[PDB]
Structure 1
Amino acid sequence: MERYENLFAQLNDRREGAFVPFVTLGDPGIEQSLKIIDTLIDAGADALELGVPFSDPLADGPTIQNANLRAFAAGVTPAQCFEMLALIREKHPTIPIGLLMYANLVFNNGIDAFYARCEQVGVDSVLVADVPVEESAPFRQAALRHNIAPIFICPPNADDDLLRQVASYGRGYTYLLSRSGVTGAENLHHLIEKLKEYHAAPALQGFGISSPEQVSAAVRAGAAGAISGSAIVKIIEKNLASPKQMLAELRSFVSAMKAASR
């Protein structure tokens, strides 16, 4: 497969930025999460960025720390995550699906085996938040042997040495970090340019993106789209006791962000 190549071909022929929602799988329960994801896609998400519940989300702010805890409260495990993932790919054949992982979960049972399981379930990419490019060899090799794109973060403090590594090693999309700190709805031209100069996979901006003008702006800066997590997770958070409203609030945020990508 080539879901990202193809989706970016399609988007470029209609001059549209990608809009990519992040949610924690299994938050707040498995069925509700499955419905939240179908609603996201129904609402216009061009691709999905999905978090697997981990015990120590060290690159994550409180909104998502709380989405990890809700998932564990529901009893979600990595295994259940992969079953969910195969149910998503069976329902939606062409949407690119990427995982946001922490290293211990990828390494735990064998790096190569984790990427074999991604390939069998239909995942298209994986970003390991605590594996810098300097430690990524074993990870990127196993992803390419299983046809998985290994996604790297291009941080605000990147030097030219890093830009080149990110462009040479990454596939699918380049994750463009909007600022320092951690995920959180509460808190780059040249990077973009150098990435295209060095032929990096199309960039997607993220961290802090919470409103529709932001989406329009990223595309304008040259990013090929934007990812947004905390602002979608907050909506789930607010409407925990009223599910119907949760989907209707979600549906509306998404189409507004999506419509801003055009």
Structure 2
Amino acid sequence: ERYENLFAQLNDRREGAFVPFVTLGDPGIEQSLKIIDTLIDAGADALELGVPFSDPLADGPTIQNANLRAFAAGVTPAQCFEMLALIREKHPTIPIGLLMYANLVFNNGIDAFYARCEQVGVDSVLVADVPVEESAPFRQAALRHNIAPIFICPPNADDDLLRQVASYGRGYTYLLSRSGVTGHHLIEKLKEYHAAPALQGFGISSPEQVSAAVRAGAAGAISGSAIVKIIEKNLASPKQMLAELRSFVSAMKAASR
């Protein structure tokens, strides 16, 4: 719902979307809530929020430490959902996507997890370690609760995969910039198969990359490590952290217009 409206609005302005990623609770619940508000006020079209997990086997050192810092603050999934409800109560239209690891979704029941997402106002869920091959129960539960299940389109994806990602995905299609962990042709075929708008992710850390993605045909770009890095080098300076995050996000978003 919120994604469909956002992209419809952005399309009318001939601009791409800039979506930053952060770990909920990093470096703390209070500072994280302030970081998130700064991102939105700086120009973020949507958010990608990670729930701290013990074993983020799909993330590089930057996010690894983001998760570690959050755990140092005692951040738990229950507290993350409390944060999410608060964020939605403050910002009614911004699309909110969660970056999850399968066990946190499966833990108390898959259906129950997506039901909770729907009640706090979450818009999409990307389960990092669930490939299309194991996605059935997750995508089904997502749809039953009006949550967009995010699918990943790798750079070496074959036609078969493209069709599956286009048919099963919702909200937006995740376009991997490369293989590995966090730290043109596929775009056209996705549109041919009526796939959800594509958002390029992984390695996006500069304004020109945001402009390149949009010109390539993508609906926008996602940036994580670049954002988290600003947090990790300003821990002792809360204010400056927010100031630098704002300058960064404003620069990235400007590149999408």
Write the deviation string for residues 201-242 of structure 1: whole angstroms up to 9, x where unpaired. 000000000000000000000010000000000000000100
Q: What does 1:55-134 align with in structure 2 at a 5 Å threshold?
A: 55-134=54-133
Q: Distance in 2 between matches of 1:159 and 1:122?
A: 34
DSSP 3-state at the match of 1:147: coil
Partner of 1:139: 138
TM-score, length-scaled by structure 2: 1.00
Residues of 2 paired with 1:134 and 1:74: CA distance?
Answer: 35
How far off its partner does 1:142 sit?
Answer: 0.2
- Provide, for residues 151-184 of structure 1, a one-character-per-residue CA deviation record: whole Å limited to 9, x for no partner: 0010112111000000000010000000011000
Q: Give the Cα separation in 1 of the matches to 2:210 and 2:246.
A: 17
Q: How far apart are the structure 2 equivalents of 1:157 and 1:104?
A: 27
Q: Deviations over 1:233-254 (max 9, x none)?
A: 0000000100000000000000
Q: Distance in 2 between matches of 1:111 and 1:222?
A: 34
- Secondary structure of 1:260 counterpart: helix
- Where 2:122 maps in the other structure, the secondary structure is coil
CA offsets 1:50-81 (integer angstroms, 9 cap, x no match) = 00000000000000000000000000000000
Distance (whole Å) between structure 2 residues aligned to residue 130 and residue 160 of structure 1: 21
Shift of 1:111: 0.2
SS where residue 256 of structure 2 aligns? coil
CA distance in 2, matches of 1:6, 1:238: 35
**Structure 2 counterpart of 1:46:** 45
Count of residue pairs the alignment pairs up: 257
TM-score by length of 1: 0.98
Secondary structure in 1 aligned to 2:18? strand
SS at match of 2:156: coil
Q: CA deviation at 1:108?
A: 0.4
Q: Deviations over 1:87-136 (max 9, x none)?
A: 00000000000000000000000000000000000000000010000110
- The 1-side partners of 2:174 and 2:212 are apart by 16
Which of 228, 231, 254 is equivalent to 1:233?
Answer: 228
Identity of aligned residues (%): 100
- What secondary structure, in the 3-state scheme, does the structure 1 residue paired with 2:49 have? strand
Q: Where does structure 1 lack aligned partners over 5 or more consecutive residues? A: none
Kindly report structure 1 stretches of 4+ aligned residues shifted beyond 3 Å: none
Distance 1:87 1:155 in 2: 34
Matches within 5 A, 1:151-170: 151-170=150-169
CA distance in 1, matches of 2:155, 2:134: 19
